[PDB]
């Protein structure tokens, strides 16, 4: 709790008379202490009011002696926020949310999911999907593959000189990709409002048949067998469950699903809506349950193996002997000297039930204010989440997302509208975007400039700052500091220990997690490039 009005009166004592702004603080603080309620959101907002009233005074009477004491109070308030969110704690809705959008859900994913299912039978599995978009991944593959061979022919006579920037290939292919997306988006807009009310898949199908020389019956078979498959595996349609409660959110989701073909970004939107509406736990399909914390204590990590690769080896080991996921890599565990391998073999083979190899989630006690998130490399990462339905913070995150898109699209829309090619569209976008740059937004603006390239070029990672981690991180900042609409600052892993997804509940560092599906690094760029050229032989 906070100090009493009376107490504040002693500590901030000044020979001078009470400023009206001080009197207001005094009143907000007293009002807060006497706040007779158990509603967390209510208590938080009153904290917020109090904190704002303090900032006003302080930012007006910069010379006031009261400021020492009032700064102490702003410190106390930060702590109070944590006190509030760490009370009225109860277990999350027992749902496991997964998202697979845009094609057939893979058997591998189904295997990862199965491990969650086994350990946590008391939880409800929801495998979210879009019933109208099973053909999106095909479209993306057809577009990217065509553009690849276009760019290769174009550069056929330069690609193998040593000094050949693989990047010249990527800039050029992106011109072709962008054109092909405008081509598809345009056809789409010519169809979507017909009286025949066609679906996304209907439009994609037509397009592919006529413009990529694909067979319709095969497309249809793939479609129905993707829908068949997902329904048989916990599948639930986002279109049939009022996840999108307003056009704005459907629009954002759609620009990712259709215009960019960024399935991960579309997934970023869905998971927030699903937690908002149903509460529970979100998990990317490449996460696995946490390993029992004490299972492996007896075996000591060699000094030559780093922390992360040790966690990896543990996982490869459990899989070597239990084979819960065929045929899980063992590339790291086979490098172990013998004596070590046998220490793993002994321990793992002794355990009898999957029950006692991985930890059960059990009750995850959270407050209606918070959302918990996993960490990675010093930043939050949204591959794993916990939130009660309708939580304050989850709303903050959703709001951050809408605010970011709004800014993005205000500058992006006209640029696209121009039908310019990629390069010129980018300049129109950038000139606009950067003309509105301030110290406060400059970083954000820098991080979204290469938006159009996300998914097709190396190190285009705008997603982070629209719908991914960045949005969460600023939402935390908002929450923790009783701020609103924060764009400049992001809380990092060292800031968020109170909001961490419990370390013993999650195995990040899975074999599937080792590679991304909306992005790729410069070294796999130099790699995919070669694969491309090698093949083009």
Cα–Cα distance list, 349 to 61, 316, 317, 319, 345 (Å): 70, 14, 10, 11, 6
**Which CB, 346 or 514, lies closer to ligand UPG?**
514
Q: How far is the CB of 267 from ligand UPG (least distance, A)?
A: 4
Q: Of 114-122, 196-204, 283-291, 423-431, which part binds ligand UPG (CB under 6 A)?
A: 283-291
Q: Which of 28, 120, 131, 382 binds ligand UPG (CB under 6 A)?
A: 382
Q: How deeply is 9 buried, as exposed, middle or buried, from its count of CB atoms within 10 A (0-12, 13-18, 19+)? A: middle
Decide which of Mn ion, ligand UPG, none touches 200; Cβ closer than 5 to 8 Å per partner kind.
Answer: none
Q: Reduced to 3 states, what is the DSSP secondary structure of residue 372?
A: strand
C-beta closer to Mn ion: residue 92 or 264? 264
User: Which residue, 374 or 416, has its beta carbon nearer to Mn ion?
Assistant: 374
Phi/psi for 483 (5° steps) reads -110, 175
State residue 387 phi and psi, 5-degree precision.
-160, 135
- The reply on whether position 280 binds ligand UPG by CB under 6 A is no
Mark the segment that binds Mn ion (CB under 5 A) among 70-78, 106-114, 205-213, 279-287.
Answer: 279-287
Query: Segment near Mn ion (CB under 5 A), from 102-110, 246-254, 457-465, 510-518?
Result: 510-518
Least distance in angstroms from the C-beta of 479 to ligand UPG: 20
517, 524, 525, 533: which one binds ligand UPG (CB under 6 A): 517
| Three-state secondary structure string covering 426-495 | HHHHHHHHHHCCCCCCHHHHHHHCCHHHCCCCCCCCCHHHHCCHHHHHHHHHHHHHCCCCCCCCCCCCCC
Contact 261, 139 (CB under 8 A): yes
Residue 535: which residues within 8 A CB-CB, separation 6 or more? none
Of the candidates 518, 520, 529, 532, which one interacts with ligand UPG according to CB under 6 A?
518
Binding site partner of 137, from Mn ion, ligand UPG, none, Cβ cut-off 5-8 A by kind: ligand UPG
| Helix H or strand E encompassing 201 | helix 200-211
- Smallest gap from Cβ 283 to ligand UPG, in A, equals 8
Cα 458 from Cα 522, distance rounded (Å): 5
Binding partner selected for residue 100 from Mn ion, ligand UPG, none, CB under the kind-specific 5 to 8 Å limit: ligand UPG
CB 84 within 8 Å of CB 47 = yes
- Of 173-232, binders to ligand UPG (CB under 6 A) are none
Q: Which of residues 47-106 bind ligand UPG (CB under 6 A)?
A: 99-102
3-class secondary structure, 509? coil
Minimum distance from residue 519 beta carbon to Mn ion (Å): 10
Q: Does 381 bind ligand UPG (CB under 6 A)?
A: yes
**Residue 260: closest CA among 456, 521, 461:** 456
Which span (104-112, 362-370, 438-446, 505-513) binds Mn ion, by CB under 5 A? Answer: 505-513
516 binds ligand UPG per the rule CB under 6 A: yes
Check residue 264 for interaction with ligand UPG (CB under 6 A).
yes
Task: Assess 397 for contact with ligand UPG (CB under 6 A).
Answer: no
* Contact pick of 316, 396, 513, 532 for Mn ion (by CB under 5 A): 513
How many degrees, rounded to 5, is the angle at CA 238 between CA 137 and CA 189? Answer: 55
Q: Using the rule CB under 5 A, is 268 a contact of Mn ion?
A: no
Asked whether position 511 contacts Mn ion by CB under 5 A, the answer is: no
Residue 240 phi/psi, 5-degree rounding, is -110, 10
Question: Mind spelling out the 3-state secondary structure of 395-424?
Answer: HHHHHHHHHHHHHHHHHHHHHHHCCCCHHH
Interacting partner of 316 out of Mn ion, ligand UPG, none (Cβ under 5 to 8 A depending on kind): none
- Identify which of residues 284 and 511 has a Cβ nearer to Mn ion in the complex: 284
366 binds, among ligand UPG, Mn ion, none (CB under 5 to 8 A by kind): none
**Cβ proximity to ligand UPG, 225 vs 293, nearer residue:** 225
Q: Minimum Å distance from CB 286 to ligand UPG? A: 5
Q: Which stretch binds ligand UPG (CB under 6 A): 33-41, 176-184, 225-233, 511-519?
A: 511-519
Q: How far apart are CA 380 and CA 524, in angstroms?
A: 24
Residue 381 interacting partner from ligand UPG, Mn ion, none (CB closer than 5 to 8 Å by kind): ligand UPG
From 104, 130, 286, 316, residue interacting with Mn ion (rule: CB under 5 A): 286
Max CA distance (Å), the chain: 87
- The nearer residue to Mn ion, 130 or 286, going by C-beta atoms, is 286
CA separation (Å) from 29 to 5, 40, 48, 52?
6, 17, 11, 11
Alpha carbons within 13 angstroms on the beta-carbon side of residue 281 total 30
Pattern 454-473, binding to ligand UPG, x per CB under 6 A?
---------xx---x-----
Report the alpha-carbon distance of residue 130 to residue 136 in Å, rounded.
10
Q: Is 293 helix (H, G, I), strand (E, B) or coil?
A: coil
Binding site for ligand UPG (CB under 6 A): 99-102, 137, 263-264, 267-268, 284-286, 381-383, 463-464, 468, 516-519
């Amino acid at each position: 709790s906070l100090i009493s009005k009376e107490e504040l009166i002693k500590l901030a004592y000044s020979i001078r008379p009470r400023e009206n702004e001080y009197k207001t603080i005094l009143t907000n603080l007293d009002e807060y202490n006497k706040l007779t309620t158990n509603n967390n959101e209510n208590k938080y907002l009153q904290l917020k009011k109090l904190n704002e009233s303090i900032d006003v005074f302080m930012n007006k009477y910069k010379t006031s002696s009261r400021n020492r004491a009032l700064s102490n109070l702003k410190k106390d308030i930060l702590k109070e926020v944590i006190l509030i969110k760490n009370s009225n704690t109860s277990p999350v809705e027992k749902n496991l949310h997964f998202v697979w959008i845009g094609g057939e859900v893979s058997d591998i994913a189904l295997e990862y999911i199965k491990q969650w299912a086994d350990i946590n039978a008391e939880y409800n599995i929801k495998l979210w999907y879009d019933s109208e978009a099973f053909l999106v991944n095909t479209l993306k593959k057809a577009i990217v593959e065509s553009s690849t061979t276009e760019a290769l022919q174009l550069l056929e006579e330069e690609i193998q000189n040593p000094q050949f920037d693989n990047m010249k290939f990527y800039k050029k292919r992106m011109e072709f990709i962008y054109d092909r997306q405008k081509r598809f988006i345009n056809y789409y807009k010519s169809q979507i409002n017909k009286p025949t009310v066609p679906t996304i898949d209907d439009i994609i199908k037509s397009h592919l048949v006529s413009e990529y020389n694909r067979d319709e019956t095969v497309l249809e078979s793939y479609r129905t067998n993707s829908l068949r498959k997902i329904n048989s595996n916990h599948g639930i349609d986002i279109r049939a469950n009022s996840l999108f409660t307003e056009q704005e959110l459907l629009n954002i989701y759609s620009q990712e699903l259709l215009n960019r073909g960024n399935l991960a970004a579309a997934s970023d939107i869905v998971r927030l809506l699903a937690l908002k509406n149903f509460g529970g736990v979100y998990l990317d399909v490449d996460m696995l349950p946490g390993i029992h914390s004490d299972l492996f204590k007896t075996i000591s990590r060699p000094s030559s193996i780093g922390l992360d690769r040790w966690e990896m080896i543990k996982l490869e080991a459990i899989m070597k002997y239990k084979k819960y996921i065929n045929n899980y890599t063992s590339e790291n565990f086979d490098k172990l000297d013998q004596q070590l391998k046998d220490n793993f073999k002994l321990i793992i083979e002794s355990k009898s039930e999957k029950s006692e190899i991985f930890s059960k989630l059990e009750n995850l006690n959270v407050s209606d204010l918070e959302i918990k998130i996993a960490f990675a490399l010093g930043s939050v990462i949204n591959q794993a989440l916990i939130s009660k339905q309708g939580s304050y913070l989850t709303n903050l995150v959703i709001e951050q997302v809408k605010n970011r898109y709004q800014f993005l699209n205000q500058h992006l829309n006209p640029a696209i509208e121009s039908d310019n090619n990629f390069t010129d569209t980018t300049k129109i976008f950038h000139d606009s975007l950067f003309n509105s740059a301030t110290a406060e937004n400059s970083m954000f603006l820098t991080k979204i400039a290469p938006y159009l390239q996300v998914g097709f070029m190396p190190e285009a990672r705008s997603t982070i700052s629209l719908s991914g981690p960045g949005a969460y991180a600023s939402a935390y900042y908002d929450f923790i500091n009783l701020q609103e609409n924060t764009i400049e600052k992001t809380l990092k892993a060292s800031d968020l220990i109170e909001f961490k997804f419990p370390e013993n509940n999650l195995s990040q560092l899975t074999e599937q997690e080792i590679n991304s599906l909306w992005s790729f690094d410069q070294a796999s760029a130099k790699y995919q490039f070669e694969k491309y050229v090698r093949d083009y032989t």
